[PDB]
RNA sequence: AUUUCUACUAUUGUAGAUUGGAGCAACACCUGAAGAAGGCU
RNA sequence: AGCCUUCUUCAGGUGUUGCUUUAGAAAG
DNA sequence: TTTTTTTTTTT
DNA sequence: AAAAAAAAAAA
């Protein structure tokens, strides 16, 4: 029943916030109460916040880490020398692994720890850990040091540009090395570690140690913060804190992923081919892959992902991975580390035939090459031979042709064409030697003439007579050069795509996608959890949430630096149960953590576990069964049990209050239950109070206070209007439904010049972006773990959705429910009509306008709504839902109102039209000039030679860009702001002709965004009809995959294939390229599909489509059969066959249909037509007034039809 | 005017949509280079 | 010797379509 | 039952 | 109507 619509998965959702006031005198002042201590932590956080440059920067941090590097390395072992803090001692004593004992000094010489733990004194634990960090940051100099090196090189000759580095893996490379060395600079540059027994006189014989104890490393500190800064700023947005409010977390050490690293390692066969290629020279490995059947190898899915990819692609492994990668596998398979990083630099090692041609003509193979590399070769030299003698293997090349195509390519005519227009380019491109021009050109004439009047073409080309003509006629009486430039670029986007389309090659090329995706993904995998072993400090901030008598709510963060006292005490001592602040903390438990409790106890004869409090006397802990055989020793009772009583009678657990937590383990008789209740129930917001005395001395000890702000919890009157607005005001409930995952992140937006103050990008923004988790509290529920294992295998995937869909449809077989039925396209972007699930058309729906009124009393002015239309089959192009000021949600169309032609101009009148899809229009035609701008610049420079007026300023655009493809041509051509764009262009040019300045005009905009913002008042249109059935319906959709023919590029001219011709062609994506990057389709399902799974009803998340991750997990699912008609069930949604929605009469069901001049549909058959919209007919056919509302009502009617059979 | 996006208003704002961080793969063009083939003077 | 076109490769930038990983306490 | 053409759109 | 042609479904 109603029960089988409710969300039963794990649900993570991040909340950003605000967290700088703004100051304005038209924004309501929020935060009063705290708002000295808000200013003076934004005065210390403003304090610290911010290619030849870069690498310029990097040298010298470089050089300076190698002088902190070789003289720290003659001094960590000094242990008459160095002490430490006390809590800086408690930190490496975790870090260490040891136990810290009892000290009764606050600094604690290295000399005085001659205590013995475990069979070794306590400062030699100390030493160790410094000596190990000291060979990782060396490891990493060398590693940093080589592409520093390499790129530098690179930058400083000009003919060695091809050799750079990845630019990836060097920032993470240096990433990594600022941590290690940051583990030593900063407790240094804290004082954490000093040198006190030196001010006696030593200096004949100390002066190395008493120079290093004074070096001011708060400069190198600061300049690894500065490159680290630079690199981790991506989208305008630098990390700032990691902060955690449950303070369990705060000293958390790095997660180990060696479980994860050892099967990813596993499936990429890399054992093997280390084993296979170790002992061999590179000449020998390069032997190997040379020998290597090219086709069967790249065929054969039991090898490895590696070798498949060498086999049609030369695809080094990258840098950071490569070097981790030999490091971690080398020393356990008893191997020299040099022997397998040898082997895997060896790995892609790239190598051209016509290099090796050119070298060294015999013992040339082309079999010896990867499919792609030889192919290429062999295809463009022997198009070149078909007119002229090329030093190349004929014979060879002819041979590899034929063995993948099957037939004599040579003879081929799409082959024979191709060589036609190469042949057509070379002899034009030397007429067009404008340095030296031949001197008898007559010959070169002749050869183009001879060329052009010889092709046989191998398909119907219809442009190509006029291309042909132009160019003939510049060459032999040169009447028009523009149009010649047209017909060469056009002939050279004819020959591009030319090459390779005489299937085979294609279907090569759509597996080497695949295989390098696959690829790709490994080794990015493999590099992240690489780099989490050197990860050392995760959280940087401890805090807490403060919340005062107005509801304004604060983040009061201290940071956990290496100082004299403990920064976690300092906060939770100052709270109590009888002050004036609230505050709120994240006591939890998760099985992660379980995990690491159990498995970590020590048992040993002297060691003192730091888990000896969670492990109780019982029999159940077997240290041998739990590190070799855990998979195995978890499924027996008596460690379950020993869990459960570890769980409800150990020290930790009644010291910690783990019976708060209500756990219920009687029904749990398996690890994996014990993992479901903790993870289901292990969550409380634990209130106290603070007062304003604690806050002033924290906050002075340097404790941040930061606001948390958005629009509407800080406005006047502070209604929740928006999702994350109702979520954080959730949260606050402590409801484990609705959880604050107790980590989140502190980011800040340095402004933008030109920006004013007044708007958010003139401003110092910083950014809080809290998590929430929705766990459902019902019953079994699935993690996001089970939900990512789920989501990689595509068949659990489809019996996921076939059981998904088996208990929606029996939940509404016998109720009334209706289908809604959505049409898409260009003249209308969508098309609603909902169906009864007889078939009868229904709707009344009331379309409102709006008018702004001005009040008397200024702050009192608002919108208001008034009923204009009444709509049966909608378009939702222009329509949004509103909320009228009386609290009614309304269908409002957008285009009603006029807008105003500048914006904050109270007085003026509206005069502007407002329709959605012009903007798409307008967008398209920007980056079809921004475009034109990149490839054609001097043609777009020449649109306003002589200040020419808007009717000719167009027509020279139209000569130059093609129309939008719907809609009157160049309609909506966006005039005022193209001239700008192109004026700016000749500015630049004109000032010395800068690539930056170029850069930031002809790059393309992005058409992400505005799509996305306009898909998204459709959304709201769904959600919103949906929602007032009662959410009794299905969505019956169409199946866009399938491009019937092709289509011609946005960009250029440049021809589109069709599914046939290529079987990744998709409809959606041909569409969005004929339109220059602004068709809307696929953002339509991935927005309503991620839309129906996460629905609320003021409290509860109810899922009508199965889950989903990415476009393949509803996409690649089972059809439903037995059935009038093929559809997809994905939940509510059906994806049916777009095949006669369109061409089909609403009431003869004949296809014999046209859509006329006004987009009419007409019957030839029986006389229908739209426009008699007067005559009443049955199932209210009447209601159909266009082609796009009958085919709504088809795409409605073939679910309806095949709902009444199915069930 | 915004956590942010889209459309607005000038209402100490309004309406809808909103899961973030780091990346990987293919394609398009631009910029900096290299190798080869053939051609011109 | 100078230069041109063609093909391929390397690095980056910007777009377009996709796809992953990460997001709660780790002692042999 | 075989076969061709069907989602998009304009001049 | 067209338009470098596959699986679904009209005749
Ligand atoms: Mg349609
Ligand atoms: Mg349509
Ligand atoms: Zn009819």
């Known amino acids: 029943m109603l029960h089988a619509f409710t969300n039963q998965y794990q649900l993570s959702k991040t909340l950003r916030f605000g967290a700088t006031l703004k100051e304005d005198e038209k924004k309501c002042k929020s935060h009063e109460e705290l708002k000295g201590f808000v200013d003076i932590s934004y005065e210390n956080m403003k304090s610290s916040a911010t290619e030849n440059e870069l690498v310029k920067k990097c040298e010298r941090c470089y050089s300076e880490i190698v002088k902190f590097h070789n003289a720290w390395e003659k001094i960590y072992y000094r242990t008459d020398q160095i002490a430490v803090y006390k809590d800086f001692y408690r930190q490496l004593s975790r870090k260490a692994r ?53 790129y530098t090189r690179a930058l400083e000759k000009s003919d060695k540009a091809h050799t750079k580095p990845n630019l990836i893996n060097f920032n993470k490379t240096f990433m990594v090395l600022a941590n290690l060395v940051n583990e030593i600079v900063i407790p240094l540059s804290n004082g954490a570690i000093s040198f006190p027994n030196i001010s006696k006189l030593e200096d004949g014989e100390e002066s190395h140690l008493i120079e290093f104890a004074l070096n001011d490393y708060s400069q190198l500190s600061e300049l690894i913060g500065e490159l680290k800064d630079a690199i981790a700023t991506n989208g305008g947005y630098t990390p700032f804190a990691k902060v955690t409010l449950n303070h369990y977390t705060a000293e958390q050490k790095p997660h180990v992923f060696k479980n994860d690293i050892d099967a990813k390692i596993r499936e990429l066969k890399l054992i093997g081919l280390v084993e296979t290629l170790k002992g061999k020279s590179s000449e020998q490995i390069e032997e190997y892959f040379s020998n290597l059947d090219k086709f069967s190898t790249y065929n054969d899915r039991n090898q490895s992902v590696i070798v498949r990819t060498q086999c049609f692609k030369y695809k080094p492994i990258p840098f950071l991975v490569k070097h981790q990668l030999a490091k971690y596998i080398s020393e356990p398979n008893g191997w020299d580390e040099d022997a397998v990083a040898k082997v895997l630099d060896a790995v892609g090692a790239i190598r051209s035939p016509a290099h090796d041609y050119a070298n060294n003509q015999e013992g040339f193979d082309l079999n010896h090459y990867p499919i792609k590399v030889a192919f290429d070769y062999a295809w463009e030299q022997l198009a070149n031979s078909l007119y002229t003698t090329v030093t190349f293997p004929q014979e060879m090349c002819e041979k590899y042709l034929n063995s993948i195509y099957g037939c004599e390519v040579s003879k ?50 219809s442009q190509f007579e006029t291309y042909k003509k132009d ?51 490994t080794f990015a995998e493999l590099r992240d959890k690489f780099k989490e072993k050197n990860e050392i400090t995760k959280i940087t901030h401890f805090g807490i949430i403060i919340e005062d008598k107005n509801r304004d709510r604060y983040l009061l963060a201290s940071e956990l630096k290496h100082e004299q006292i403990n920064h976690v005490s300092t906060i939770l001592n100052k709270l109590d149960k009888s002050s004036e602040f609230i505050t709120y903390q994240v006591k939890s438990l998760t099985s992660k953590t379980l995990i690491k409790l159990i498995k970590n106890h ?62 219920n383990f009687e029904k749990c008789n398996s690890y994996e239950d014990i993992e479901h209740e903790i993870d289901q129930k292990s969550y409380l917001l634990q209130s106290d109070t603070i007062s304003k005395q604690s806050i002033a001395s ?31 005001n959730h949260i606050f409930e402590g409801s484990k439904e609705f959880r604050l995952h107790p980590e989140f992140a502190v980011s800040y937006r340095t402004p933008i010049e030109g920006y004013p103050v007044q708007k958010r990008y003139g401003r110092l923004q910083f950014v809080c972006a809290f998590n929430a988790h929705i766990v459902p509290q019902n019953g079994e529920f699935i993690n996001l773990k089970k939900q990512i294992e789920n989501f990689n295998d595509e068949d659990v995937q489809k019996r996921n959705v076939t059981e998904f869909n088996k208990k929606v449809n029996h939940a509404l077989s016998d109720k009334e429910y209706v289908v809604i039925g959505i049409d898409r396209g260009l ?23 709006k008018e702004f009124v001005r009040a008397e009393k200024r702050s009192e002015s608002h919108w208001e709504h008034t009923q204009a239309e009444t709509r049966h089959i909608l378009d939702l192009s222009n329509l949004r839902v509103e909320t009228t000021i009386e609290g009614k949600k309304v269908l409002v169309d957008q285009s009603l109102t006029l807008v105003k032609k500048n914006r904050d101009t109270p007085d003026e009148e509206a005069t502007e039209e407002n329709k959605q899809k012009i903007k798409l229009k307008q967008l398209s035609y920007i980056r079809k000039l921004q475009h034109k701008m990149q490839t054609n610049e001097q043609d777009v420079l020449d649109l306003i030679n002589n200040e020419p007026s808007d009717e000719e300023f167009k027509k020279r655009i139209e000569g130059l860009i093609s129309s939008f493809g719907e809609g009157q041509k160049y309609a909506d051509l966006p005039i005022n702001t193209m001239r700008e764009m192109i ?39 769904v959600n919103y009809i949906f929602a007032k059935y009662s959410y009794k319906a299905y969505i019956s959709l169409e199946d866009l995959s399938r491009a019937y023919g092709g289509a011609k590029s946005g960009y250029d001219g440049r021809y589109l294939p069709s599914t046939s011709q290529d079987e990744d062609v998709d409809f959606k994506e041909q569409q969005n390229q004929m339109l220059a990057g602004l068709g809307t389709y696929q953002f339509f399902e991935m927005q309503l599909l991620k839309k129906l799974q996460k629905i609320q009803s003021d409290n509860t998340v109810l899922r009508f489509v199965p889950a989903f991750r990415s476009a393949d997990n509803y996409r690649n699912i089972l059809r439903l059969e ?44 029986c006389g229908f037509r739209s426009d008699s919209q007067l005559k009443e007919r049955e199932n209210n056919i009447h209601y159909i007034h266009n082609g796009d509302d009958n085919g709504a009502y088809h795409i409605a009617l073939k679910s309806v039809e095949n709902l009444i059979q199915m069930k």
């Open 98 to 150: 040891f136990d810290a004992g009892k000290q009764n000094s606050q600094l604690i010489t290295l000399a005085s720890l001659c205590g013995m733990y475990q069979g070794a004194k306590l400062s030699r634990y100390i030493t160790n850990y410094w000596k190990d960090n000291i060979t990782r940051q060396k490891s990493f100099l060398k590693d940093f040091s080589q592409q520093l090196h390499q």
């Open 412 to 461: 081929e005519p799409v082959f024979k064409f191709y060589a036609d227009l190469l042949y057509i380019r070379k002899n034009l491109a030397v007429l067009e030697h404008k340095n030296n021009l031949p001197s008898n050109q007559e010959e070169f004439i002749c050869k183009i003439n001879n060329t052009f009047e010889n092709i046989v073409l191998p398909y119907k080309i």
């Open 471 to 521: 160019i003939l006629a510049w060459i032999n009486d040169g009447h028009d050069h523009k149009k010649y430039t047209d017909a060469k670029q056009q002939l050279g986007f004819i020959r591009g795509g030319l090459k390779g389309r005489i299937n085979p090659y294609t279907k090569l090329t759509n597996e080497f996608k695949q295989i390098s995706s696959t690829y790709g993904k």
């Open 602 to 663: 020590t048992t040993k004869k002297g060691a003192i576990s730091p888990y000896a409090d969670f492990h109780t006397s019982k029999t159940g802990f077997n240290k041998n069964e739990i590190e070799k055989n855990w998979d195995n020793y978890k499924r027996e009772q008596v460690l379950v049990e020993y869990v459960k009583d570890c769980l409800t009678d150990s020290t930790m657990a009644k010291n910690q209050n783990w019976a708060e937590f209500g756990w």
């Open 698 to 728: 924290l906050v002075e000890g340097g404790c941040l206070l930061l606001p948390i702000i958005n629009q509407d919890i800080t406005s006047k009157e502070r209604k929740d209007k928006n999702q994350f607005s109702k979520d954080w």
């Open 827 to 849: 003249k209308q972007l969508a098309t609603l009509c909902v169906l009864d699930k007889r078939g009868k058309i229904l709707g009344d729906f009331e379309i409102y306008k």
């Open 983 to 1021: 004026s700016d262009l000749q500015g630049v040019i004109a000032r010395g002709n800068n690539q930056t300045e170029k850069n930031k005009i002809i790059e393309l905009d992005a058409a992400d965004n505005l799509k996305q913002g306009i898909v998204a008042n459709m959304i709201g249109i």
């Open 1122 to 1165: 037995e059935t009038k008609y093929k559809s997809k069930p994905f939940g509510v949604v059906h994806f049916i066959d777009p095949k006669f929605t369109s061409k089909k009469c609403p009431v003869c069901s004949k296809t014999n249909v046209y859509r006329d001049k006004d987009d009419i549909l007409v019957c030839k058959e």
